[PDB]
Amino acid sequence: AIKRGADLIVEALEEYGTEQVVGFIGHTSHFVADAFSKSHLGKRVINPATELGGAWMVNGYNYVKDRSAAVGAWHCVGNLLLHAAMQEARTGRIPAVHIGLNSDGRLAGRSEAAQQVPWQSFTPIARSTQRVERLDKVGEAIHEAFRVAEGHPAGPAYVDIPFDLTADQIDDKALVPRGATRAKSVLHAPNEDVREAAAQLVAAKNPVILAGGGVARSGGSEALLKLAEMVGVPVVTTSTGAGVFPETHALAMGSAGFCGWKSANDMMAAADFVLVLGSRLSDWGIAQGYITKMPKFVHVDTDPAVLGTFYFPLLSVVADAKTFMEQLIEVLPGTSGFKAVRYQERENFRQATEFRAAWDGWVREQESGDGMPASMFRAMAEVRKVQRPEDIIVTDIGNHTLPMFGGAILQRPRRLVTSMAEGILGCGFPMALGAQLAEPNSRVFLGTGDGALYYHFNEFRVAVEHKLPVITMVFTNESYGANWTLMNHQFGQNNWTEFMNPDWVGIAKAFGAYGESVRETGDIAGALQRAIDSGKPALIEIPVSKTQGLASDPVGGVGPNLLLKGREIPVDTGGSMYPGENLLHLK
Amino acid sequence: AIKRGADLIVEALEEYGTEQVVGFIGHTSHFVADAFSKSHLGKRVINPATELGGAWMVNGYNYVKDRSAAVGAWHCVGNLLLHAAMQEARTGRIPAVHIGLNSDGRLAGRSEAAQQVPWQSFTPIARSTQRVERLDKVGEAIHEAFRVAEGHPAGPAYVDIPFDLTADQIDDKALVPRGATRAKSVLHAPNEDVREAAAQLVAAKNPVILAGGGVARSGGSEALLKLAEMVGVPVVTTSTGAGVFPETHALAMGSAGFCGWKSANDMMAAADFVLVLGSRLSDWGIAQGYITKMPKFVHVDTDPAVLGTFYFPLLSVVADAKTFMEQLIEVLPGTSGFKAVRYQERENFRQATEFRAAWDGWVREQESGDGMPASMFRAMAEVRKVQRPEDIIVTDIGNHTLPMFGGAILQRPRRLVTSMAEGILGCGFPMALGAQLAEPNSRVFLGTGDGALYYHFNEFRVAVEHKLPVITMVFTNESYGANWTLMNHQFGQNNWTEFMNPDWVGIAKAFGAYGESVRETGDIAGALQRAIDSGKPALIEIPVSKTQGLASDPVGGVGPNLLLKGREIPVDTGGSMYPGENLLHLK
Amino acid sequence: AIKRGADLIVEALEEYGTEQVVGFIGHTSHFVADAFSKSHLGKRVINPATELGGAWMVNGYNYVKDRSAAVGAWHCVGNLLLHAAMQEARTGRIPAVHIGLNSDGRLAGRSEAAQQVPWQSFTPIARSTQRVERLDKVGEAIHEAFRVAEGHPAGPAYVDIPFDLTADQIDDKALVPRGATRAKSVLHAPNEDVREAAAQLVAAKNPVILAGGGVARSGGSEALLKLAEMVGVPVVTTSTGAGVFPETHALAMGSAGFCGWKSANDMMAAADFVLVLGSRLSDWGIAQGYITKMPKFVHVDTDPAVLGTFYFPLLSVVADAKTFMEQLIEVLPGTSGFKAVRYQERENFRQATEFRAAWDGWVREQESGDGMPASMFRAMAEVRKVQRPEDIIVTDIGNHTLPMFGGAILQRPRRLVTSMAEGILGCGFPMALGAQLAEPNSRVFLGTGDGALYYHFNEFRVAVEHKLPVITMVFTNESYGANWTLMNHQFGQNNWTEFMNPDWVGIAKAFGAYGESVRETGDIAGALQRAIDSGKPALIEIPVSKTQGLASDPVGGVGPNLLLKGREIPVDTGGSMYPGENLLHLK
Ligand SMILES: Cc1cc2nc3c(=O)[nH]c(=O)nc-3n(C[C@H](O)[C@H](O)[C@H](O)COP(=O)(O)OP(=O)(O)OC[C@H]3O[C@@H](n4cnc5c(N)ncnc54)[C@H](O)[C@@H]3O)c2cc1C
Ligand SMILES: Cc1cc2nc3c(=O)[nH]c(=O)nc-3n(C[C@H](O)[C@H](O)[C@H](O)COP(=O)(O)OP(=O)(O)OC[C@H]3O[C@@H](n4cnc5c(N)ncnc54)[C@H](O)[C@@H]3O)c2cc1C
Ligand SMILES: Cc1cc2nc3c(=O)[nH]c(=O)nc-3n(C[C@H](O)[C@H](O)[C@H](O)COP(=O)(O)OP(=O)(O)OC[C@H]3O[C@@H](n4cnc5c(N)ncnc54)[C@H](O)[C@@H]3O)c2cc1C
Ligand SMILES: Cc1ncc(C[n+]2csc(CCOP(=O)(O)OP(=O)(O)O)c2C)c(N)n1
Ligand SMILES: Cc1ncc(C[n+]2csc(CCOP(=O)(O)OP(=O)(O)O)c2C)c(N)n1
Ligand SMILES: Cc1ncc(C[n+]2csc(CCOP(=O)(O)OP(=O)(O)O)c2C)c(N)n1
Ligand SMILES: O=C1CCCCC1=O
Ligand SMILES: O=C1CCCCC1=O
Ligand SMILES: O=C1CCCCC1=O
Ligand SMILES: [Mg+2]
Ligand SMILES: [Mg+2]
Ligand SMILES: [Mg+2]
């Protein structure tokens, strides 16, 4: 049957499981928009204020879904705004398919052409970059994009299609690949490796299980709870893993790292052995700038590239995290040295509970006071009083990241959202809107700095039109507070850190969102109640200090090395000159 | 003297004539910001709301200056936002040096590293992309960047410097190249070429001189006025050339092209010969999607790559525009057939004045009218009543582009600003702020769509803090009106075009800008005067139609081919299968 | 008319002035080879032993022609051999169009595909890299390739065409661009610049004119002779400029640089002013590893990118070399201080003739001597006894390069050929075959090392079949003699330098070439005469020392810095670890 390339694009997207389209209009996307209007995808298309805001929504949506359920579809030069969000998806393991409609292929390669997008700029970023030359390759290329995006490692795939192909027509027989079943990802470990890991766990004086975001992707929460209680071993997470183990449990230390919980950092410093499940041991994660000293450890991942790249394990194992834990549960009764007793009765339990109690005491101290400015730990204590197990916490990047991570106490996977891998400022608001689109009946709370909110608050258009009831706290300090604080330490003076805020309540009201400031009241509790009652996107202005959080608060970190010390470098005396030095030799 | 890398960067920027920095803080830019605070250039730093907004400011500043007088300096991941603005600077011939401070060079190449920016993503976009490996190359790299950016063709240069080199120190002897060197750009043509062009001009029955942006870069206004009057020849411009010839002159036909003046398109259709000076005959300029039929023509440019790429001239000449005109003026008295006659008495004068009169009458009709929705030609007529010769007109991309081009009547060069080469939505507001920074004796009037203003209105923080009294007219239609209109022509139905606006007056007020709506009053003249009187950046909300301008108004255009018709494409019958087709051959 | 893509390719190559094809068969080049067999150009096809050998032939042919008169046409995977020759054409300013026929476009992008050539591997090398997507772009792409290749700077252009488009057919109306267009390259300087250069030249006590390869491209020999005699100024060349000034003239100092004439290096050290015409002042040319100290200088080039990149001139001028000289000759009589005097009576004449005499005496000593091992200066003295003014001297890269440059005494341009820009071993033999194809009225003498001849002596198949009577002297030392010598200077010990030779006379005989060894006879003069008399390609085996030439002979050089001295580098003490260091902190 004769079909337009635009219709075939829509058909392929539907075949591979697309639920949500984020699209931007222009003459190159006209046929695609027309085709979507005839599909069940048409109704709920999001047309964002900008393409980078929309690309952040795709990342929030897909981070919580663990598949490319949201897709981008972009008119030519709007694809030039994608790179920042695309880079986060790469290193942050977010599946995400982007379809770029380029200008007419007849005009490609002409030196004075307009809007001929340099798709080769994505080659260093996307996990897959494809330029489609021929109409009969459109289905094929979209099939490949999903294959790469939803693999191990997950990441972004970009497909560039000159838009004349979207207008052209062809017979459709077999053109969209249909009917594939993917390989299972329940990879089992060798029995000997399971037994060696069991033997280490039972021999250790102060063991730890370290669960990263792979445990969430694997669906391993039930197995982790059973394992940790059976061996009686404290659980530490990464920031992407937080919530895979209930953080109200006596064994829960929280997340290790420089914006994490001191209980977790104390536990990692005390440990003699670690079982690492589904973590890449990253720079701004466990490695803390490659300064952290790992105890002896077993490392279990589905991606061999992460195993042994920097930290050399005692044993590296290619396996699924859930599956590995189930294998371990089966072998432990027959492991020499294993004793089946309640976790509360183990010798290692007191030290772990002490670390947690000391952390919890510090956090309670940070929640105290009723000043202006307010404490961001106090703001999070108020969120917790109105927070359900399914609800999602979002943050942006800055001093505020630390109190958001420290005040988040989670019970389910994928409830903590940000630009985890890259720390790209401005992510938080649009990622929160994407997460809300993915889970319409979950409540989404965002804690954002003022410098951060400046980026994409234009997306209040989408929030108000689509009635996305995200509750946003904007922490105001008239500064890039992390940099204010760090530069004062480093040089004795800050520069480039200060700015004027708008009347944020006035901004919210100008869009038709709920707005309220607690500057004169301190009534964070009441503001959250009123925001929730509104049924609208909401903005609550909360004044904070320039110093609280990332750049100041003692959580047991060792890195990263942000305030590096320069070295004196020798000149080159081999005889070659600098450019222009010729003039200095003239007599 | 022992100096930090950061200090050497600042010294190099000052040496090569930097006047204005647009810079964004983060730990990788800390040493550079500290260095700037100790220097003359430190007094002129804009900290923008976002890096893309700031990169658009660099483009507006440098478009009007024709050199890289503004420079960008960005913390690592913020560089990921630059690509859209950088692509405009490339094809639009805007000099622009961007300094990206990457993360620690020690951490480069590690797969789980944070904030290691893929500088190779700029290779297909910048005219020069350099990754600096060594401290003793920092001055050399910056020198090279300016040389490439300020060449023929002009464009963007990106320099990636790992930030450890900014903290490191070295003896500075000869390290920053001083005393640089620059050839004149007054390239002279051979006498043969001059004589042939003069003979063609004199022999023509209906000649035209076509003046592009190269006449502006050349400084050729005085020579062009003398040559046009001496031979008695109508003048047509490109959109970047508008204003090099006084647009109130009897011989001024205005700009050719699809958003241009119908007098210019009429004259181009009537002409038997064209002398083209400083134009690249581009897709969305004179070529109109490569549909325009050029008369026999002589083509004169400083860049040989533009000569003969698509339109084959009678004669191609490598020469400076001002210089070539001066050579022609000297040769005309001894050219066969030449006689000195007043231009008003030449046989071709009446035809040209008739074309201009017809256009002027149509413009008067488009201004004719009071009430709401307002005509954008009426808005421009009101601007002209309060416009000085050095004032600058800025537009964004959309239906509104055509009335902004058509209602701009200019008397000096470089007074008309937009994303001319690439048509990138949202350029207008930040390019206007950049232009105002560069040209503090110019009043800057921006006519922007609502869909466009949505992108970078966050930059009202810069406009208010730096007291930049740009007068912005936001034309409201609650639509991407160009696409509503094109899609209605193409399909009889629009999709992805409609959206809500905030209360734009409320937005302005929340930033401390002047705000006023004429929705109820129709009082455009009063709103302009009150906006001028305030001394502040101003936002005037003006309701308009969905359809007026680019996608509807007949100005004599022939292209581009935005609404292309699909072709039926044969399948491949070679024998090879589609992916997944194997399952269809099982029985 | 309906035409195959293959036919349209041939038509385009003929239109843009192709004279010679170097082509390699495979199924992807079948249609193109069939098309060539039906065309005028089909009569001039070389099928080389390998694609790299053939690409070197294209370089030799086009170096001497200064246009892309030879073109490559290659079956898919054979394109993978081009990169070395392509890189020489880029930095050495050799025009060269290469047409790669890729595998079926239907199969592109499949991960398990065969012979899908990564054309993106050429992007960092060619001046233009184009992948053609559509049959109706084949003529356009070829047109663009010639425009880039034959520009300023000249260089290589690569066009990748999937071979299905060569079999496909289309109506040909307007598809191959005809009537192309080309601006003159006689760029004139402004009068100010001409007058200043003349005043500097006249005021100097010890001037020099430095003439590079741009004087050859310009055709400026006649003007240079007149200018040098009129002002009475010694002439120095680059290695690509040698022969633009008659090297038997009293004012001829020869070529400066590390493999040049000591008379030229002496004169450059004595000079108070230099006028540089058509030179890029390159690393292994005049810069000598960026160590050379230039006197105050005026720098004149057609390519602004060479002016002021490293050596900062007193004055930079964009102009054609021949033209600028002609302008100078016209201005000199009215320049203050100028007087017409015979050059032999100027006060600077004696110094220059003394330099040349000292060099000539040293060369005579180096020729002094009979017996074995032979002096390579003696071999060149024997060539000169049988050398015509249009004959061509070719060399490879090694110790032997210096005596080939030093014993070549030339009277016309473009008579000295090698991999000048990149020093790529094995260039000599195939570049000599290319040069012979281009210049059938030239006798071509190649002086090659043994290590070099090893690369492409397989091309004796081409030399014999096409009756190309190149006279090759193979200098035998059973070593990479430059590296034996440099390593002995550097370490007191060589490594990886020594090897066996075949019986080279036997090799020649096995191909049907003339072969003779002088190992027993010393009879170089007789061997040259017998080789000429045969009418065949010839190989003369001449034993030589391991050490004579580049790495040993004192010619007044100061660089480059090939034998650099290491520096002690501080470690990083920031706190971060090496990969695997974790295991060292466990106790
Ligand atoms: C300002 C700032 C502060 C931060 N502070 C911290 C902090 O204090 N602590 C912290 O942890 N992070 C912090 N981060 C986040 C950090 O940068 C990383 O994003 C994070 O630590 C990576 O988590 P992960 O190692 O679990 O790997 P992820 O990035 O979540 O990747 C998942 C891993 O699991 C594997 N995997 C996937 N599926 C499976 C499966 N089925 N079975 C087995 N393996 C699987 C993958 O191959 C990969 O190795 C911070 C970031 C910012 C911007
Ligand atoms: C929505 C939209 C609508 C548009 N409508 C129109 C329209 O109607 N008409 C129109 O013209 N454009 C229009 N444009 C702009 C268009 O896309 C191009 O940006 C513009 O036409 C290019 O102008 P130009 O040819 O003068 O070259 P520029 O881009 O200005 O480049 C300068 C040229 O002059 C040469 N040059 C520089 N210095 C010298 C010198 N000293 N001497 C000689 N030569 C020199 C350069 O090498 C180059 O060729 C539109 C753009 C958009 C986005
Ligand atoms: C082992 C080895 C040893 C070598 N030894 C030496 C040595 O001793 N001395 C030496 O000189 N080189 C030597 N070379 C060669 C050297 O590396 C360079 O290839 C050479 O010096 C470059 O010559 P050039 O500066 O004349 O520029 P070219 O590479 O010849 O480039 C031509 C220049 O002229 C300009 N030009 C072109 N047309 C015109 C025109 N119409 N008008 C004006 N300008 C024009 C171009 O833009 C360019 O700047 C050696 C190479 C090797 C491999
Ligand atoms: C795109 C981008 N620009 C800049 C930065 C550097 N950066 C990281 S956190 C931060 C401060 C953010 O300020 P704000 O949102 O107000 O939070 P606070 O530090 O005040 O809590 C900055 C400037 C970045 N990571 N990404
Ligand atoms: C980044 C980007 N996204 C999208 C577009 C496509 N586009 C061009 S003009 C236009 C309409 C803009 O709407 P508005 O600013 O309201 O102007 P109007 O057409 O209503 O005058 C759009 C969507 C583009 N060129 N660049
Ligand atoms: C492809 C390549 N490989 C290696 C070299 C390094 N190289 C340059 S000169 C030289 C010696 C060549 O030996 P030969 O041809 O025998 O000349 P000789 O030095 O003995 O005169 C070598 C190995 C190079 N420049 N290019
Ligand atoms: O989508 C469009 C419509 C025409 C002008 C520009 C553009 O991007
Ligand atoms: O980009 C960042 C992130 C957190 C530390 C400070 C900074 O500038
Ligand atoms: O040219 C060919 C023919 C088929 C085998 C391989 C190849 O390259
Ligand atoms: Mg803040
Ligand atoms: Mg609009
Ligand atoms: Mg040898």
Pairwise CB contact (< 8 Å): A454 & B458? yes
Residue of C nearest to A296 (CA): C586
- Secondary structure (3-state) at A13: helix
Q: Is the CB of C297 under 6 A from ligand 6?
A: no
Ligand nearest to the CA of B453: 5
Sign of CA dihedral B257, B258, B262, B267: positive
Nearest by CB to B309, from A112, A118, A424: name it: A112
Ligand 11 centre distance from Cα of residue B257 (Å)? 22
Structural biology method used: X-ray
Cis peptide before A153 (omega within 30 of 0): yes
Pairwise CB contact (< 8 Å): B280 & A112? yes
* Rounded Cα distance, A237 and A239, in Å: 6
List of chain A residues whose C-beta atoms are within 8 Å of the C-beta of residue B506: 506, 509-510
Burial B176-215 (b: 16+ CB within 10 A, else e): bbbebbebebbbbbbeebbbbbbbbbbebebbbbbbbbbb
Q: How far is CA A106 from the centre of its chain?
A: 40
Q: How far is CA C107 from the centre of its chain?
A: 39
DSSP string computed for B257-286: STTS-HHHHHHHHH-SEEEEES----TTTT
Residues A65, A75, single domain; the answer is: yes
- Secondary structure (3-state) at A502: coil
Which atom from ligand 8 is nearest to the alpha carbon of B25?
8
Pairwise CB contact (< 8 Å): A30 & B566? no
Residues B491, B576, single domain; the answer is: yes
Pairwise CB contact (< 8 Å): B566 & A167? yes
User: What are the two backbone dihedrals, phi and then psi, of residue C237, each rounded to the nearest 5 degrees?
Assistant: -120, 170
* Rounded Cα distance, A262 and A251, in Å: 14
Residue of B nearest to C318 (CA): B183
Cβ contact A490:B30 at 8 Å: yes
* Rounded Cα distance, B39 and B10, in Å: 8
- Secondary structure (3-state) at B255: strand
List alpha helices for B439-480, DSSP H.
Answer: 450-456, 460-465
C-alpha angle with apex C160: C157 to C161, nearest 5 degrees? Answer: 135
Cis peptide before B560 (omega within 30 of 0): yes
In this structure, the residue with its CA closest to atom 2 of ligand 7 is: A26
Cβ contact B118:A124 at 8 Å: yes
User: Chains B and C: how many Cβ contacts under 8 Å?
Assistant: 84
Residues 87-106 of A with CB under 8 A from B: 87, 91, 104
User: What are the two backbone dihedrals, phi and then psi, of residue C267, each rounded to the nearest 5 degrees?
Assistant: -65, -40
Q: What secondary structure letter does DSSP report for B546?
A: S
Which residues, in sequence order, are CB contacts of A85 under 8 Å at separation 6+? A52, A55, A56, A58, A59, A424, A427
Residues B317, B448, single domain; the answer is: no
User: Chains A and B: how many Cβ contacts under 8 Å?
Assistant: 348
Domain boundary among C369, C403, C428: C369
Looking only at the bridges linking them, the beta strands covering C444-449 and C392-395 are: parallel
B225 touches chain C (CB under 8 A): no
Residues B427, B468, single domain; the answer is: yes
Residues B163, B214, single domain; the answer is: no
E strand or H helix at A446: strand A444-449
Residues A548, A409, single domain; the answer is: yes
Tell me the two tokens of residue A562: 């942000």
Q: Which residue segment(s) compose the domain that B60 sits in? A: 1-187
Cβ contact C377:C404 at 8 Å: no
* Rounded Cα distance, B147 and B182, in Å: 9
In this structure, the residue with its CA closest to atom 6 of ligand 9 is: C26
Residues A558, A518, single domain; the answer is: yes
B178 touches chain A (CB under 8 A): yes
Domain boundary among B369, B402, B435: B369
Residues C362, C476, single domain; the answer is: no
Burial of C535 (0-12, 13-18, 19+ CB in 10 A): exposed
How close A580 gets to chain C, by Cα (Å)? 5
- Identify the bridge partners of residue C417 per DSSP, sorted by sequence position: C394
Q: How far is CA B263 from the centre of its chain?
A: 23
Tell me the two tokens of residue C15: 């239109």
Pairwise CB contact (< 8 Å): A108 & C583? no
Pairwise CB contact (< 8 Å): A285 & B111? no
B270 touches chain C (CB under 8 A): no
Burial B225-248 (b: 16+ CB within 10 A, else e): bebbebbbbbbbbbbbbbbbbbbe
Q: Is the CB of A397 under 6 A from ligand 8?
A: yes
Burial of A554 (0-12, 13-18, 19+ CB in 10 A): exposed
Find the CATH number of the domain harbouring B287.
Answer: 3.40.50.1220
- Which chains lie within 8 Å of chain C at 3 or more CB pairs, if any? A, B
C290 touches chain B (CB under 8 A): no
Ligand 12 centre distance from Cα of residue C457 (Å)? 15
* Rounded Cα distance, A417 and C298, in Å: 62
Residue of A nearest to C312 (CA): A580
* Rounded Cα distance, C529 and C236, in Å: 33
Cβ contact A181:A249 at 8 Å: no
Pairwise CB contact (< 8 Å): B183 & C147? no
Residue of B nearest to C314 (CA): B181
> What does this entry list as its resolution, in Å?
1.2
- How many domains in chain A? 3
Residues with CB under 5 A from ligand 11 (ion): B 449-451, 477, 479, 481
Taking alpha carbons only, the member of C136, C278, C284 closest to residue C216 is C278
Residues B560, B581, single domain; the answer is: yes
A461 touches chain B (CB under 8 A): yes
Domain boundary among B369, B384, B405: B369
- Secondary structure (3-state) at C141: helix
Ligand 3 centre distance from Cα of residue C18 (Å)? 25
Pairwise CB contact (< 8 Å): A575 & C291? yes
DSSP string computed for B140-188: HHHHHHHHHHTSSS--EEEEEEETHHHH-EEE-TTTS--S-------PB
Residues B325, B440, single domain; the answer is: no
Nearest by CB to B152, from C180, C304, C572: name it: C304
In this structure, the residue with its CA closest to atom 7 of ligand 8 is: B26
User: Chains A and C: how many Cβ contacts under 8 Å?
Assistant: 94
* Rounded Cα distance, C163 and C100, in Å: 9
Tell me the two tokens of residue B217: 């870069």
How far apart, in Å, are the Cα atoms of C87 and each of C47, C116, C125, C152? 22, 22, 6, 17
Find the CATH number of the domain harbouring C138.
Answer: 3.40.50.970
A295 touches chain C (CB under 8 A): yes
Cβ contact B393:B415 at 8 Å: yes
Looking only at the bridges linking them, the beta strands covering A273-277 and A207-211 are: parallel
Pairwise CB contact (< 8 Å): A491 & B84? no
- Which chains lie within 8 Å of chain A at 3 or more CB pairs, if any? B, C
Cβ contact B542:B374 at 8 Å: yes
Residues 543-582 of C with CB under 8 A from A: 558-559, 561, 564-565, 567-568, 570, 572, 574-577, 579-580, 582
A587 touches chain C (CB under 8 A): no
How far apart, in Å, are the Cα atoms of C152 and each of B376, C127, C148, C301, C308? 47, 11, 8, 10, 17
DSSP string computed for B297-349: EEEEES-GGGTTSSS--SEEEE--HHHHHHHHHHHGGGSTT-----GGGSTTH
Q: What secondary structure letter does DSSP report for C190?
A: P
Q: Is the CB of B238 under 6 A from ligand 2?
A: yes
Residue type, C40: H
Residues C168, C194, single domain; the answer is: no
Residues A381, A446, single domain; the answer is: yes
Which atom from ligand 7 is nearest to the alpha carbon of B401?
5
Ligand nearest to the CA of A187: 1
Burial C269-288 (b: 16+ CB within 10 A, else e): ebbbbbbbbbbbbbbbbbbb
Tell me the two tokens of residue B252: 């001024």
In this structure, the residue with its CA closest to atom 49 of ligand 1 is: A280
